[PDB]
Structure formats: C-alpha cells, structure tokens
C-alpha cells in the first residue's frame, strides 16, 4: 500500500546552561530508522533500525554533516525568533520542524511537507502546491517574505518530488522484511466485576504493525462510541503496538456485546464475543 518518510527536529534553548538541545529523528511509516542528539557523545547520525545499518560510511558521514547543518540553522533561528517576538533572553523556547513525503500505493510521489512550529504553535508551513506559504503570525510574515524573495519553495519542491521519494523507495526495498510486513493483532478479552450488577469487558489487540487500527464495541450491532473507553495506541517497545477498548456490561448482558477489530494484517475483520 501507501508509504511515507518523515524527519522530526526539535531545538530547545537553555539560557545560561549552554548551547540549545537539538534532537533529530527519521521515520519510514511507523518505524524509526535514525537519530541525532546534540547531547550524546557520538556527535553523529546513528542507526535505529536493522536495515539501515548497512548503508556505508558515505551515507553516515553525509547525513551527519547535513544533520549538524540543520542543528546550526536552528541555533540561529532561536535567536532570530526571540528577536521577532521581542522576548527575553532568559526564557527557554522551542523550535520544531518536520518535512518529508508520501507515495501512494503505486509508489509515486503523492504529497510533500515542510513546516515549523515555535513554542508549540504553527509558525509557517509550505502549502500543498509546494509553491506558496501559510504564515499566521504577523511576526511570521518576515519569514514568509524572505523565503519568497529567495525562492526557498522552489528548492524544497525539487527535493520533495525527487530525492525524498527516490530514497523512500530505496529504504522500502532494502528493509522489505521490516517495512513491507504486516503483524496482525493477537486479541483477547478480560472480564472483571465492578459491582454485583455491572462488569467491565475489555477488548485487547496486541503485537500489531503498522499502528493504524480500529477497535470498537457494538451492543446488538449498534456502535457504542460514546460509551467505550479507548486508550491511545501505544508502543510495546519491540516495534509493535497495543491498544484496548472497554465497555461496562449490566448483569446477564455479556452476550449482547461484540468487539470489532480492523487492521491491515487481518485476512478479514474480527468480531469477538465474551462466551
């Protein structure tokens, strides 16, 4: 099916306590593959997935040189923004940047992204046409005008449509075992008495990949959305994800409830019942 490549960059100023912290991570779909941490001892981009460990030194030296170049532009940006917002030099502030690309199920370029946030809120973003910019803040207007004059969108469009997608395809092929796989959820239910007249039925999906999954309860086939407690999908630590959904069932009514599970790794959607 469809695939994406995304790089996430966070820079946090630390007034007095030295240079800002800078952390970069890269993902293909829901699998992390590289990281760089300004505070770690290597000072290099490092592997986080088995399939990338095989790219050679030209790859690691080049990504380390470019990730360091990003670190430094964010260091300048923290100063440029303090200025644009006339803020104090004593406070910690955060700059975040994400960019990347999506290819459809034919593996052709589908969408590109390039956007920044300052202290948790949207600052500027490249539009879908990859030719124009969205800036909400009056402060952000200076950045937009500068980028237009310097034709920054043309350079990024080139990268998002060519380099970005070409390398996602290469990763998909090289890590086919990890990336082009699907791990179906292993399911079960639990039953626990809340009172003498109600019980909580919890529907569990464990060990699945990718993260996208739909878990729902129905009572006599009617969706119980407002009455289902759902937790956020969470990582197990081994590359798979977990999630649960629970409902409170009045005495004698266990047979009325069904838990439904949709996930790309399943041959067909599951319908489970406590019985």
């Amino acid at each position: 099916g469809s695939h994406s490549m995304r790089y996430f960059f966070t820079s946090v100023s630390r007034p007095g306590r030295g240079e800002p912290r800078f952390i970069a991570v890269g993902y293909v779909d829901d699998t992390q593959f590289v990281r760089f941490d300004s505070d770690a001892a290597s000072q290099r981009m490092e592997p986080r997935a088995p399939w990338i460990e095989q790219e050679g030194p030209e790859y690691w030296d080049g990504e380390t040189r470019k990730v360091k170049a990003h670190s430094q532009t964010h260091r300048v940006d923290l100063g440029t923004l303090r200025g644009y917002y006339n803020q104090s030099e004593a406070g910690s502030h955060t700059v975040q940047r994400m960019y990347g690309c999506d290819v459809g199920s034919d593996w052709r370029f589908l969408r590109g992204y390039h956007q920044y946030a300052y202290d948790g809120k949207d600052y500027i973003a490249l539009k879908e046409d990859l030719r124009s910019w969205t800036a909400a803040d009056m402060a952000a207007q200076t950045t937009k005008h500068k980028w237009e004059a310097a034709h920054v969108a043309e350079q990024l469009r080139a990268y998002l449509e060519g380099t970005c997608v070409e390398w996602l395809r290469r990763y998909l092929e090289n890590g086919k075992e990890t990336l082009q796989r699907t791990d179906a959820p292993k399911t079960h239910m639990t039953h626990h008495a809340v009172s003498d007249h109600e019980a909580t039925l919890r529907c569990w999906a464990l060990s699945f990949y990718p993260a996208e999954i739909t878990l729902t309860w129905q009572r006599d086939g009617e969706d119980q959305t407002q009455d289902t407690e759902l937790v956020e999908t969470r990582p197990a630590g081994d590359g798979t994800f977990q999630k649960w959904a629970a409902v409170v069932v009045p005495s004698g009514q266990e047979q009325r409830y069904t838990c439904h599970v949709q996930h790309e790794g399943l041959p067909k959607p599951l319908t489970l019942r406590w019985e």
């Binding site: 532009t73 960019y99 990024l156 990268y159």
Partner: peptide, 9 residues
C-alpha cells in the same frame, strides 16, 4: 536522506 540546503527563518 535529508534535504541538503540551509534554510533560516
């Protein structure tokens, strides 16, 4: 692979 051109706000 990362974008290789500098960008400053």
């Amino acid at each position: 692979l990362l974008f290789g051109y500098p960008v400053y706000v």
